[model samples]
Target: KDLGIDLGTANTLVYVKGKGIVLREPSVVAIQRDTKQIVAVGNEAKNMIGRTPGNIVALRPMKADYETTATMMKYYIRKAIKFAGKPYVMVCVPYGITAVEERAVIDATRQAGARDAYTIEEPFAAAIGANLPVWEPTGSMVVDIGGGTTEVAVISLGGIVTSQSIRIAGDEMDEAIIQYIRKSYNLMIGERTAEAIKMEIGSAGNPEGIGNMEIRGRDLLTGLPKTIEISAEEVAEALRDTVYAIVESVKNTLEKTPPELAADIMDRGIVLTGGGALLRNLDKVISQETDMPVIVAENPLDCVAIGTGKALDHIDLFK
Candidate 1:
């Protein structure tokens, strides 16, 4: 058997080579502090956050913590292939990751019961998953905005010709919203509430016709519960800097592209993938800013996971 793992910051997806995505869960685990045993994992552990007992700490390793990452990987791997044997695993990771980071991911996958472990860059996997003509000598630009990283790349002949990866994406957007509400409205909001707000009304470009949303949080001045109405334009304003930064990275990659590849990209346009691609009007903003057609992947969130699995079928092309 073969497996592909997208060990994302917000969520983890495990795809069994032949069965497609077999397991999808939040990257959370609840461990009993005293015994160092896992009390819960995935969805269950995520639900336990902010509600767990003192001795049982629920957390996610958004990490440089190799051991914790390995443990989580082992759980997901075991869960994905219960009836199967040791599998060759492919992990989709951030672009520009150091060799040390790559080694840690490889070691984690190996310890997680893989017969062999290999790493693939996120944007490359996203290109394959988005069905871009990566193996052809034409340019296929891909923008992958996940929870923690935004990856922009131009792919040609099954290789990345130019690329940029920034640590500002969905998570940063959410945090931006949180800070905005706190600073502007004096309402303290939780990450979950901020994300909800973002999903409901967040926009990168104009939000004229979009309606307003009512949110509940704590009133900082009164120290009491409060409900406030926020508009889509407000969310767009809150996300302005982060959105600009992501767009700039894409432009930067385009500027670095070879003339031939750049011409090809002009013809093919750019494809957007990853969970952050779901942001409303983000494609339009990118298109307007870059003056190129932008297409969001059909299955943005699943692109990396799906591509990681699909790459196994054409292993020679990736190498």
Candidate 2:
């Protein structure tokens, strides 16, 4: 059997050769603190976040910088392989990772019951997933804003022409929201609460009409449980810097693209994929800032996994 894996910071997606995506789960694990033994993995582990007892903790194995909690990662990868009965695997990576990190991924996959392992860069995979005509002379630009990183690329002739990857993305945005609530309202929220607020009310650009969501957290000054209503505009303000960083990276990548490809991009427009693309008005803001058409891919959240799975059919194209 063969499998394609999108090993992301927030989630992991597994695709079997002929079977689309076979598994989609949070990239989290829960373990007993004293024994250091695995308690759960995936969604179950994610649920343990902020709700776990003192003896156990839930953790996302990968960080924004592509660093892995090696022990936890190894444990879960092995478990996932066991659950899937093992297979040949292709794992995707963010652009600009060092050779050492690549080696770590290869080794980890091998240890997790992969007969063979291959690596693909995120932006190109996203392009392929979006059904862009990369083999043609026309250029296609892709912006994949995932949990840990945002990748921007110009693709033509089935290869990358110019690309940029940044560590500031979904996780940074969540942290920014948490920080804002802590400082402004004197409320401390957990990652999950902050993420929920982001999803319900967050926006990348100024959106008309006020939207609000009730958030539960601890009052920092009073040390008591508190609930507060937050507005979309406020969430957008809190996330401004993080969103701006992603936009700047996109601009930088566009600046480096060849003139012909740049023109091609202007005509073909840009495609947005990954979880961060779902943020309200992101495409609109990016389009306004770059003065180019920006389109969100169908099923933006699953694009990377779909692309990786599709890559299995064209393994020769990667080299």
Each candidate structure's TM-score, on Cα atoms with residue i matched to residue i, is: 0.94, 0.88
lDDT against true structure, model 1: 0.89
Residue 210's lDDT within candidate 1 is: 80
Tens digit of per-residue lDDT, candidate 1, span 38-147: 77778768677657567888777762778887888888888888566788888888897899999998898888788878889999999999999999999899999998
Q: Please provide, for model 2 over 199-276, each residue's C-alpha lDDT reduced to its tens digit, 9 standing for 90 to 100.
A: 888899885674888999999878999999888888999999998898898899989988999999999899999999
Candidate 1, clashing residue pairs? none
lDDT at 195 for candidate 2? 91
lDDT of each prediction vs. the true structure? 0.89, 0.83
Stretches of candidate 1 exceeding 4 Å from the true structure: 37-39, 44-54, 317-319
Residue 306 of model 1, lDDT score: 91
Q: How many residue pairs clash in each candidate?
A: 0, 1
Q: Model 1, residue 130: what's the lDDT?
A: 95
